[PDB]
Structure 1
Amino acid sequence: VGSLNCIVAVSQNMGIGKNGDLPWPPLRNEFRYFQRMTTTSSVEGKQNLVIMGKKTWFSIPEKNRPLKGRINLVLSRELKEPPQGAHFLSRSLDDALKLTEQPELANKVDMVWIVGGSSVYKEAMNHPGHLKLFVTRIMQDFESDTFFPEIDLEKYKLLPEYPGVLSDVQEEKGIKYKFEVYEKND
């Protein structure tokens, strides 16, 4: 398997969710960015794996589950069975990552993408080693009930550019946003 990555879109007040959905109106090109970044594998013959908590799984409309072109893994401590459509169910993040080191999965999985929610991001971001954060800065406050922790810049470096990421400010529906990539190596 390849690198470990988080991807997230965050409002100005660090919100990521509200009532089991996103806090802002649908941003078509921001979803297309999430889709492109999580689907595109750098190695031929492999797919990427997305890891998410249970509420994040059910925040994806059923018609889009599992996320196409990606191996979908759901984290849950209490589910008796994998949610219909999921490819894998793991009881902890460590269990999920050790799944990716199985030989027959490692030769089919390139990047691992953490796609939320709050507790999954937090655990991944404190795991030592190489990690990238793909962060969309939604440049407006939105009412939220689920949040992302402020990034420690002594640990995470904001990259000046990244292949395949547009650096210019974007705007949809009167909402400005910009794509950022952070990297730590501790």
Structure 2
Amino acid sequence: VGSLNCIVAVSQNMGIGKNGDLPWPPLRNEFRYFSRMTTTSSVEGKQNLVIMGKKTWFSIPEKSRPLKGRINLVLSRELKEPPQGAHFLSRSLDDALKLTEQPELANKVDMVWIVGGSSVYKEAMNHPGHLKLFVTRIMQDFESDTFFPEIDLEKYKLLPEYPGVLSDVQEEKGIKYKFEVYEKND
């Protein structure tokens, strides 16, 4: 199994969601970037795995569920089986990561992408090991009810460049944003 990664878009006030949706209007190319990053695998005959909390799963439009060309794993202690359309269910992040090393998935999974929400990002982020954060900085404040955990910059280094990531300011629907890649290894 390859790299462990988080991917998120976040407003200035650290907001990632409001009432089960994003705090900002749809940003088509920002979404395009999420799709590209999570779907593209380096390794022949492998797919990437996406790991998400239960609420995040149900926040994705039904038509867009499962995330196509990726293996979709949901985290939940309440559910007894994967949601309709989902591929896997685990009871904790450790359990999900262990599973990837099972014979059913060990030779199928390339990158693993944590796509939310708050508590899954937090745990992943505070977990010793090699980890990258793909962070889109939405450069306005948006009213939010769920937030990205604090990025500890003593450990997460902001990379000065990354292949396939544009470095300049983007703008869609009057909203400026920029892409960032952070890396830790501890």
Where on the TM-score scale, by shorter chain, does this alignment land: which range? over 0.9
Q: CA deviation at 1:81?
A: 2.3
Give a deviation string over 1:133-175, Cα, whole Å, max 9, x none: 0000000000000001221110000000101101111000000
CA–CA distance in 2 between the matches of 1:131 and 1:85?
Answer: 28
TM-score calculated relative to the size of structure 2:
0.99
Give a deviation string over 1:26-70, Cα, whole Å, max 9, x none: 000000000000000011100000000000001100001100000
Q: CA deviation at 1:130?
A: 0.3
TM-score calculated relative to the size of structure 1:
0.99
Q: CA deviation at 1:79?
A: 1.1
Matches within 5 A, 1:26-105: 26-105=26-105
What is the aligned-residue RMSD (CA, Å)? 0.6
Give a deviation string over 1:82-132, Cα, whole Å, max 9, x none: 110000001111110001011331211000000000000000001101000
CA–CA distance in 1 between the matches of 2:40 and 2:107?
Answer: 16
Q: CA deviation at 1:80?
A: 2.4
Structure 2: any 5+ residue segments left out of the alignment? none
Structure 2 equivalent of residue 117 of structure 1: 117
CA–CA distance in 1 between the matches of 2:110 and 2:16?
Answer: 26
Structure 1: any 5+ residue segments left out of the alignment? none
Q: Tell me the percent identity.
A: 99
